[PDB]
Design a binder for this molecule. Structure first.
Ligand code: HEM
Ligand SMILES: C1C2CC3CC1CC(C2)C3
Length: 405
């Protein structure tokens, strides 16, 4: 299901990549996408999948396109178009200067000062969950840790019921990794059916939670609207539920396979922060785009107003022009260059939260369970989409080599 080539696209620029089902997923998701950076691929390609759209394949182009909101609008950031079209999240679906007042608020809710406050719970929950696992010598990391960890912290932050997780997590998943069970609009609406009542209720009787802060926030000297709050909160949910969850599994799948990487971290703890950047670079997992606001010529290619371009944040750090031996993980790189948390005016506000959550998990897991591996005959599957992930992660360990703290 390849869409006929628009008139403006030079056939020599065609490269049919399916962002939802890349070709050699079997070898890994980061690996499947890096095909785009082989020598045979032009820097800017056109794919006929998912209705036809462009893809920038290099760090340099992605950064540029990201900086350039005039040409490249966030108005319709998801592919396919019906998804980008139904997409109305704030601040994501807005460009500057409008973007800015909304950003400042979302920042109040997820920014540094909040992570600083939530630190001890993050550390408490990680230790608790790990200690609970330690004696079994086996889990489902995706389900047993990766999911609960980041999710319960967000539920805390948000002041929402843990009971709502499953229902919520299903809708978030349809957003980034469309199943086919429900379209973007249906998915979007059901999350919205959920949030509305909650918002209503926090306008009336404010709490200390993130939702309360958003619902009653100020934007452009006036009060945010209901619809506006619904829309920021909608985003906070997807980021909360869907980002850290998938990243931990990639990192953990790697650690489970690389004894010497684990050891390095065990002996030279001072390196965790660096390793965290390197892992974010290597196991980078987001890919969204932008819409052309007009006719524009970018690096010799003619882009037509209304064309969507995917600008894979995942790709920047995997690009050889940016990082020597990109597929290799080296905790001692002089320069770790990525754009895992995006680039430009839309730079991820929750970055601080995600880094704290990764750093704690590594430090904490390695402490109790320094030696683990993937279960014999478990075949690890990755999935592709706006946010890629791991399907399941069966780990096994000997209890006798663990440590209680
Ligand atoms: C591994 C973790 C994460 C990664 C890789 C990630 C990635 C990204 C990327 C690439 C963008 C920009 C997208 C664009 O330019 O269209 C972004 C935006 C955003 N992310 Fe993060 N994210 C992560 C965690 C989170 C968390 C935990 C939160 C908190 C809910 C969150 C909240 C946000 C928000 C609010 C924005 C929008 C900022 C704006 O539009 O000005 N993200 N994220
Ligand atoms: C929208 C944007 C791209 C992906 C998915 C969702 C949350 C965050 C920002 C990462």
């Amino acid at each position: 299901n390849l869409a006929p080539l628009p008139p403006h696209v030079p056939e020599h620029l065609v490269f049919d990549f399916d962002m939802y089902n890349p070709s050699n997923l079997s070898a890994g998701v980061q690996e499947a996408w890096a095909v785009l950076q082989e020598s045979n691929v032009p820097d800017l390609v056109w794919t006929r999948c998912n209705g036809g759209h462009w893809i920038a394949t290099r760090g340099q182009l992605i950064r540029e396109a990201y900086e350039d909101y005039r040409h490249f609008s966030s108005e319709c950031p998801f592919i396919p178009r019906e998804a980008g079209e139904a997409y109305d999240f704030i601040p994501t679906s807005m460009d500057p200067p409008e973007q800015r007042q909304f950003r400042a608020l979302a920042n109040q809710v997820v920014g540094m000062p909040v992570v600083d406050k939530l630190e001890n719970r993050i550390q408490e929950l990680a230790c608790s969950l790990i200690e609970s696992l330690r004696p079994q010598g086996q889990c489902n990391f995706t389900e047993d840790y990766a999911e609960p960890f980041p999710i319960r912290i967000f539920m805390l932050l948000a002041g929402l019921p843990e009971e709502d997780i499953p229902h919520l997590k299903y809708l978030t998943d349809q957003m980034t990794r469309p199943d086919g069970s429900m379209t973007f609009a249906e998915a979007k609406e059901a999350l919205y059916d959920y949030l509305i009542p909650i918002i209503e209720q926090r306008r009336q009787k404010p709490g200390t939670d993130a939702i309360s802060i958003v619902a009653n926030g100020q934007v452009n000297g006036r009060p945010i609207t209901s619809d506006e709050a619904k829309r920021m909160c909608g985003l906070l949910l997807v980021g909360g539920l869907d980002t850290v969850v998938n990243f931990l599994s990639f990192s953990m799948e790697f650690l489970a396979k690389s004894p010497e990487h684990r050891q390095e971290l065990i002996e030279r703890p001072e390196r965790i922060p660096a390793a965290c950047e390197e892992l974010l670079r290597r196991f980078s997992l987001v890919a969204d785009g932008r819409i052309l606001t007009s006719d524009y010529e970018f690096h010799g290619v003619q882009l037509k107003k209304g064309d969507q371009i995917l600008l894979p944040q995942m790709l920047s750090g995997l690009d050889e022009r940016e990082n020597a031996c990109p597929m290799h993980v080296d905790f001692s790189r002089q320069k770790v260059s990525h754009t895992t948390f995006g680039h430009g005016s839309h730079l991820c506000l929750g970055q601080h939260l995600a880094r704290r959550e990764i750093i704690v998990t590594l430090k904490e897991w390695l402490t109790r369970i320094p030696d683990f591996s993937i279960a014999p005959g478990a075949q690890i599957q990755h999935k592709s989409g706006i946010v890629s992930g791991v399907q399941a992660l069966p780990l096994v360990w000997d209890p006798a080599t663990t440590k209680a703290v």
